[PDB]
Amino acid sequence: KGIPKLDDANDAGGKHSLECTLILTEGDSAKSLAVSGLGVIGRDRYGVFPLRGKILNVREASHKQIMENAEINNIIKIVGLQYKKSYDDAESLKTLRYGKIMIMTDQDQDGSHIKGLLINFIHHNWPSLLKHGFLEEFITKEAKEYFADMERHRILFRYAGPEDDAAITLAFSKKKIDDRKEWLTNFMEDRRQRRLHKHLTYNDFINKELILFSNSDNERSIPSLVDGFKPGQRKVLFTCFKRNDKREVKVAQLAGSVAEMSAYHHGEQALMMTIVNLAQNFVGSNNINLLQPIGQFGTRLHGGKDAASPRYIFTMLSTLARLLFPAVDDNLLKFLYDDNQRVEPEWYIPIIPMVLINGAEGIGTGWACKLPNYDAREIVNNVRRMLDGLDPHPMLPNYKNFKGTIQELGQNQYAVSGEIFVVDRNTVEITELPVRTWTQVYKEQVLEPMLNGTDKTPALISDYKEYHTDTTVKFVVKMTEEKLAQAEAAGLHKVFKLQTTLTCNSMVLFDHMGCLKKYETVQDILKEFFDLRLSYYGLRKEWLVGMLGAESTKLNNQARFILEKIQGKITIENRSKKDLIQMLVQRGYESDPVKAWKEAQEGPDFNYILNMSLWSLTKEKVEELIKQRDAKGREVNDLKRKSPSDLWKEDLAAFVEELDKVESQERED
Amino acid sequence: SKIKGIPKLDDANDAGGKHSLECTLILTEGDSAKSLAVSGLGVIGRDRYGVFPLRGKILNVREASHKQIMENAEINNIIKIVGLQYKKSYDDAESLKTLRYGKIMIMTDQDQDGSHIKGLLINFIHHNWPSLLKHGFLEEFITPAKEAKEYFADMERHRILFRYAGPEDDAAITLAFSKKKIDDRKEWLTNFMEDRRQRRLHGTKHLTYNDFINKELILFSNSDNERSIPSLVDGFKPGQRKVLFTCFKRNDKREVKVAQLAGSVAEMSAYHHGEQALMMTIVNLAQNFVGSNNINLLQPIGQFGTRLHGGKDAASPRYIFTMLSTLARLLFPAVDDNLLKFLYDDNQRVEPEWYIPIIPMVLINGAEGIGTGWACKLPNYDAREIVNNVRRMLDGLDPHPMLPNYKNFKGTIQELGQNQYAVSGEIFVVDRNTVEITELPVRTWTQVYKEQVLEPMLNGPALISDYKEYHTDTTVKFVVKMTEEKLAQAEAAGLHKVFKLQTTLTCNSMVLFDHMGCLKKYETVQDILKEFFDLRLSYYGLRKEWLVGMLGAESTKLNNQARFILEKIQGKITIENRSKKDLIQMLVQRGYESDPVKAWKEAQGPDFNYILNMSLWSLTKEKVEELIKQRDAKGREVNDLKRKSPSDLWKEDLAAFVEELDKVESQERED
DNA sequence: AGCCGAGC
DNA sequence: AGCCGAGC
Ligand SMILES: COc1cc([C@@H]2c3cc4c(cc3[C@@H](O[C@@H]3O[C@@H]5CO[C@@H](C)O[C@H]5[C@H](O)[C@H]3O)[C@H]3COC(=O)[C@H]23)OCO4)cc(OC)c1O
Ligand SMILES: COc1cc([C@@H]2c3cc4c(cc3[C@@H](O[C@@H]3O[C@@H]5CO[C@@H](C)O[C@H]5[C@H](O)[C@H]3O)[C@H]3COC(=O)[C@H]23)OCO4)cc(OC)c1O
Ligand SMILES: [Mg+2]
Ligand SMILES: [Mg+2]
Ligand SMILES: [Mg+2]
Ligand SMILES: [Mg+2]
Ligand SMILES: [Mg+2]
Ligand SMILES: [Mg+2]
């Protein structure tokens, strides 16, 4: 009583309390479906309360965050549970307003994660209730049909023994991370083997059901080594490539298009945030943003948190996008299917390892991935050295427009330093902040405590002024001569918090086979990317030789028919379709060689000839068609004398050319 | 003096101290406008300038209830920020010592709704503290992140001060915002619309409140009518029309998310307002429950709302889908698009001034709106009755009177007199101790009736012993228990009266734009029907003219294509190896005609592309015979149309419409 | 204690 | 004391 989103069972709290079931639903929308499904009679023995999504994991969570969590407090007040209270006996259960909790979620993996978080919540606080069969689930005007069928949709969770304890702990305990790695490692291996060849116990729920979320969590959160993308990001670029927008599109509108075209199965709000992240160009985000930030996508001041609503902002492809992901290689990719609809590919195959450029980052279950940004030109140069058979030079992380320094301290560990300089004996100037330190955060958490002091720290500076621009940082700080001499003695970057450590010891990617792998150096990422991209330039040459040759044979037959027609060697006039096709066969014309070639990759068709306009017989069109035919034959031969390496070099040169123009234009604006 | 309770406020550093009267409080339209202001001020402006966002339209405090005023958080926020006190006079300089700011600078969009917000703020100060306006308390900041810092560095040229000249300023503010001035606003806007039409037949740091009201706010009041009051012709307001124009253009064969459609509408139709209002309009166009639309032109695929909550239970526009009803293009035939006047927004072609439906859609769906000085309310009418009346008028007979009719409504609508109706639900005695309610009067929602009628009957003297609910999504069933004596007493009085199942409906404001865009008051729906009929019959005449011309052009085009094909296959003509110029000149000398369809369109060198673009297939046997058939069919089709009257084509459209109306409505009842 | 981001 | 709906 007093909880606005709760519809309380009429008998809750009275003599029938333990015969009452509380339905916890995923979202308010599921509560309404459950409310209408219960009808009038269901209000006596059933309550309904909505969940806001993922529940707090209370196992290792701090006491402050637990007691301040409103959703869990609501559940506790609704059910009437008491912390630290043992439910072992029958007299103790008279404390409860509800005898059973029924979790009702989507039938998908994220629903399974909420089930497990609720199971985890009860298992941690009152293990004794689960041995009574406290928890059950509901599986799915269509709702009224479910609740009349209720026993068929009702599954009861059973606690069979200590294997149920270990399973819950395996999933939700901070101390089990390494066990989750093994747990999921053994899971992915068995699927590779299988792919190439009522009551529910908590152990079964966790190992047969929740693990599907845990694996799906990694697949959505951990990028591919090949293109550097997660599937949601890859869906975005696939949609933009297919749309080929010449003008800016509202982010919210592009997101809805992505869901339709790529079969994105999650909430669009998440897609909109991904699109925003793909377009951000501020210092510390994307070395090359593949989407253009037209409107306010956020700045280094707030670290992108100041981005405006996706309803007010627009985007389109960067001109660099199709240069890094050439459209011709789409013919080599493997495009996935979602229920008979062809969708985004397994991965794109960019011309450089984009996974290094923009700093792929993500958090899964059992594993996370963090890579810093690397310099596009430096990577191009290493690809060129490798094409010559030379070893690649080592690479330090490099952030576009970052004015500070990044120094290797050790393997995969770096010091990132901003800029500070003594101006006079009273004055220092801060012209850069370490990568991912945001201007407003630095002001509030560093300079303000330095100016005002805190309860635990003395004042240091006597004043500061802010000269920043939208992309740049300038602080001018005043200090007494004494304080500045002390600051120099301890070192200026240290005192002013301008140095941060960058450690990347989890570089975890899916390889080109879709296998999760840990990479110890970026050189190993570069090498694995290089061997794959080189063979795909081989595949591209094979594809171009075939398609260009088919196009050549096509133009040859078209030109031959036109010449024989204008010379009177052949007439189609007033001839039946059958007679014309038969005659074209007897004279040796080929069925459409492009359609034939395109179908070979997986009656005679002369339409490519007979669909030609009557203009084709005129003088200037005859001459134009002969030129096109001869041009295509020269095109075939020009391609055949290029190696895969030459083709790669052409793409690299064209990309660098545009990268210089684009980044030069950026500094102008 | 400090304010700790208003998180969205950025207080001037000197506000509340000795320099208070030298400080400005910038009120912005919305939070993003505040960020533009806070950015434009920068480090320097923080001392003498505060910024606080307004949430949109401000409470109109003139003649508002004391409760609504005291409970209004936005106004209480403004009062607390500035330090104002109700009932206090600010006259002498001593009285100003209690103010944390000496001036308020309003910063809104440079559009009409921004002007409305300016007026509401002016209204708020004028009503409570007229003395403050004599001191020059109010100012505005006009516009046409880096742009913001440019605006504020030039603030002198963007700053305009409101001036109180005298009693005509009071009259102007009262004329705009007083509930007793409705008649004066009608005259105010009548003169405006008239004087503007006359000009269409032909070719300062300070601003007085009188000039603000009469030259600026009046533009919002007029735009408020133009957006809120429907057109007699199609029954649409402009935003609804832009939706239908977009849907016709897209021609979706599959459902579309309403949020996605709204963004598509904004781009395609140049809709200038918030997309959330467009999404609500889209939801409102698709609702089929009892009491909303007799014919919904968009399909409700999702939860669009029910009669339980009166549509307020619609799910989020992000979660629901729509598309055209199959009736939409039958009511608005695509061929008549050629007769419409399409508007332009900055060289982009957008929705027409109105569609011309085959029946008066303004009577079908109950056109409704609230403007300034006028509102419009029409009930729903029955589509087949309207079709029959149109047929009666085509035959020169008199149209039957029409009572309001709501689809699937099981109750009774009785005419008390002209434009006056008693609308009754259904209640029936089952036995002694039991009555049953199977229908509620139109636009009485099931949950509201339970809460406001049956619940007070059950508890607060209690007239009934109990009730139970058998409703479905689309239907209403209440079974009510009471003592014999109480039922007899309730039955002695009206059962419909006791249970509040009768509502009166009066439509004395039927206010629409006529076909010229002139605001008109219509006394009867027969008047509406007759005015629509004359214009629509005229446009069936235009459609026939348009079709005769276009079909005739198409026939000439085919005659030339067939002639060329026949001469080619007979050897009478050869294009082989001939130059383009020689072939153009030769076709001209032989009397082939330049593209007849293009020539006809341009009428509303020679172009033989429509001939020479034909495929080589055209010279084969089957395509020759096909082309000749197509040519003769086209000639017959132009001849068949010439014989028909505009009335015959209207009858054809009505029959096709009714046939699909029958199929669609049958399928609705089976589902 | 809190960020990073694709999810609820 | 509030609905209707196109707007902020
Ligand atoms: C209130 O009703 C429900 C809420 C939810 C949660 C939720 C829960 C919250 C909360 C916020 C949210 C919100 O997340 C926010 O979305 C924002 C959308 O714009 C982008 C820019 O930034 C996002 C925020 O980063 C994110 O935090 C929802 C978005 O979609 C969800 O699943 C989220 O603050 C308080 O608790 C689930 C439900 O059922 C499944 C519900 O019925
Ligand atoms: C908080 O930030 C601002 C809010 C606003 C108002 C507003 C104001 C409100 C309020 C709500 C709203 C909200 O209206 C609601 O939108 C809903 C959108 O979906 C449909 C289904 O139903 C709509 C509601 O019928 C409507 O009531 C806004 C939507 O667009 C506006 O202009 C509205 O509740 C409290 O006061 C203006 C601003 O600056 C211009 C702001 O910065
Ligand atoms: Mg789901
Ligand atoms: Mg943690
Ligand atoms: Mg990144
Ligand atoms: Mg505006
Ligand atoms: Mg009122
Ligand atoms: Mg209506």
Residue numbers in the entry:
A (entry chain A): 452 to 591, 638 to 694, 707 to 1111, 1135 to 1201
B (entry chain B): 449 to 592, 637 to 695, 706 to 962, 967 to 1110, 1135 to 1201
Describing publication, verbatim:
Type IIA topoisomerases (Top2s) are essential DNA-manipulating enzymes ubiquitous in eukaryotes and bacteria. These enzymes exploit protein conformational changes driven by ATP binding and hydrolysis to direct the crossing of two DNA duplexes, leading to topological inversion of DNA crossovers. The Top2-mediated DNA topological transformation requires the temporary creation of a DNA double-strand break (DSB) on one DNA segment (the G-segment), so that another duplex strand (the T-segment) can be transported through.
Because iodine is substantially more electron-rich than the 5-methyl group of thymine, the use of 5-iodouridine allowed the positions of thymine nucleotides to be unambiguously recognized in the difference electron density map. However, if the G-segment DNA is cleaved as intended, then the I-labels should appear on the +1, +7, and +12 locations in one of the complementary strands in each half of the DNA-gate. This expectation is validated by our observation that the difference peaks in the previously solved closed conformation of the Top2 cleavage complex are nicely overlaid with C5-methyl groups of the three thymidine residues. Crystallographic studies have revealed that these drugs interact with the closed conformation of the DNA-gate and inhibit the religation of cleaved G-segment by inserting into the DNA cleavage sites.
